[PDB]
Amino acid sequence: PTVRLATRDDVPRAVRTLAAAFADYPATRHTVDPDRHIERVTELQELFLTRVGLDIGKVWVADDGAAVAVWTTPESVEAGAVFAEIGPRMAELSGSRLAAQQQMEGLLAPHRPKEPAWFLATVGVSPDHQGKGLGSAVVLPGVEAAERAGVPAFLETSAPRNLPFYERLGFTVTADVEVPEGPRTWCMTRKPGA
Ligand SMILES: CC(=O)SCCNC(=O)CCNC(=O)[C@H](O)C(C)(C)COP(=O)(O)OP(=O)(O)OC[C@H]1O[C@@H](n2cnc3c(N)ncnc32)[C@H](O)[C@@H]1OP(=O)(O)O
């Protein structure tokens, strides 16, 4: 279980891991077109991993990409300009589920920290390596970094099996959001010193 920051050479295994990990995720199933679903989800994960994670955020990997963690920090300053580049393509990839994605964003936006914070954008572990402690190991550096910076760490999850996993890392449910014809979503925050 060797954890370190990611390089461009790691992207291929990382994207395979994220695509496989999010294959049956409730939020992805609600917000991404079912037509060529895995292909669409794979491009979204690649687009976020490279253009957001590696370019302006922070990305960690365990066992050369068997697990991945992507964060946006208070240091992620051209998030906005990056969003004008990749934004329209992400809407195309959402396809028929763009209205559902936009509805869900409106429900979660009020519960997001308006103050500077580290956001866990996405985390995935290869299905065959799940339950072996890799997820905890990849997310821990970002959690320690947020605490060192004196800012909260924040995330959103639509899978209730993840609540214990994040609770062990010091996170607490700050919002329990009901999505119409969609998945129940929990917003979680970890203030420095949890
Ligand atoms: C997008 C966001 O910010 S959150 C969405 C994160 N990713 C996903 O939900 C997609 C699929 N899930 C995964 O890739 C992984 O299972 C992770 C990253 C959530 C957890 O990583 P793991 O290596 O499995 O975790 P680790 O071994 O460190 O800890 C195990 C705990 O993870 C939780 N867990 C997460 N996903 C699962 C799952 N599919 N089935 C069972 N338990 C799971 C459980 O609470 C488990 O402990 P438990 O059996 O005692 O309840």
Author numbering: 6 to 199
What did the paper state?
Puromycin and the Streptomyces alboniger-derived puromycin N-acetyltransferase (PAC) enzyme form a commonly used system for selecting stably transfected cultured cells.
Addition of either acetyl-CoA (AcCoA) or puromycin to PAC in solution greatly improved its thermal stability, with a 12 °C increase in melting temperature. The addition of AcCoA enabled crystallisation of PAC and the determination of its three-dimensional structure using X-ray crystallography. AcCoA binding is primarily through a “P-loop” formed by a conserved Q–X–X–G–X–G motif in the loop after β-strand 4, which allows the coordination of the pyrophosphate moiety of the CoA by the protein backbone. The poor initial electron density around the adenine moiety of the CoA made its unambiguous placement difficult and the adenine moiety has been modelled in both orientations.
